[PDB]
Ligand binder design. Structure first.
Ligand SMILES: OCc1ccccc1Oc1ccccc1
Length: 209
């Protein structure tokens, strides 16, 4: 049972700008996704301060980076608050309509694409490097769902049949054929050290083979 949705016109416009604009500094996608994961981990931490049972779905608060050269995927996993089905459909918990508006007024006033995260739509920087993005998520108040989009104006949502997650979000980047440098251990390490060195949660870079 797969539901197919149209992006709001402004989000489709943001996504086409990210895909079609010539912009070499693509590596900031990882900073933006790690920052999103950190924000989601902050939220479940804050909720657990007054209700410890919110961590019954998992006490550990962390971020994992999993490259897979055979599948040509880079997966960013966190054990944050996760997203309900409603949040997934509503632009993955973002204020994407007003954020895109603010972002594009900034771009014509001297900003560049690397500043996307200041406008709440940093998730969509995934399409700097990915031809398709899958988002698997589990929130304490909902079931496990899979969101997917290859851009082109539509996304799908289905109940996830895969591995149970407990709580949190998994962003699977199906990389473009010429963006496989982001599967290389030394390149990911360099980017994490450059842009994410002060994130307040353990970031574990998995190795392969
Ligand atoms: O988990 C990071 C993440 C992944 C995909 C889309 C948005 C995300 O950012 C969140 C999600 C939920 C709460 C707060 C921030």
């Amino acid at each position: 049972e797969v539901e197919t949705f149209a992006f709001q016109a402004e989000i489709a416009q943001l996504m086409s700008l990210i895909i079609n604009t010539f912009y070499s500094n693509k590596e900031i996608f990882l900073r933006e996704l790690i920052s999103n994961s950190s924000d989601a981990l902050d939220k479940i931490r804050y909720e657990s301060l007054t209700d410890p049972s919110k961590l019954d779905s998992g006490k550990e608060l962390h971020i994992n980076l999993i490259p897979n050269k055979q599948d040509r995927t880079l997966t960013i996993v966190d054990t944050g608050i996760g997203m309900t089905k409603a949040d997934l459909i509503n632009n993955l918990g973002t204020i994407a309509k007003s954020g895109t508006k603010a972002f594009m007024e900034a771009l014509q006033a001297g900003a560049d694409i690397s500043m996307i995260g200041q406008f709440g739509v940093g998730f969509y920087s995934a399409y700097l490097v990915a031809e398709k993005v899958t988002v698997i998520t589990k929130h304490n108040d909902d079931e496990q769902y899979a969101w997917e989009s290859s851009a082109g104006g539509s996304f799908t949502v289905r109940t996830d049949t895969g591995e149970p997650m407990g709580r949190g979000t998994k962003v699977i980047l199906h990389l473009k054929e010429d963006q496989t440098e982001y599967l290389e251990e030394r390149r990911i390490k360099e980017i994490v050290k450059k842009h994410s060195q002060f994130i307040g949660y353990p970031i574990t870079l998995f190795v392969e083979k």
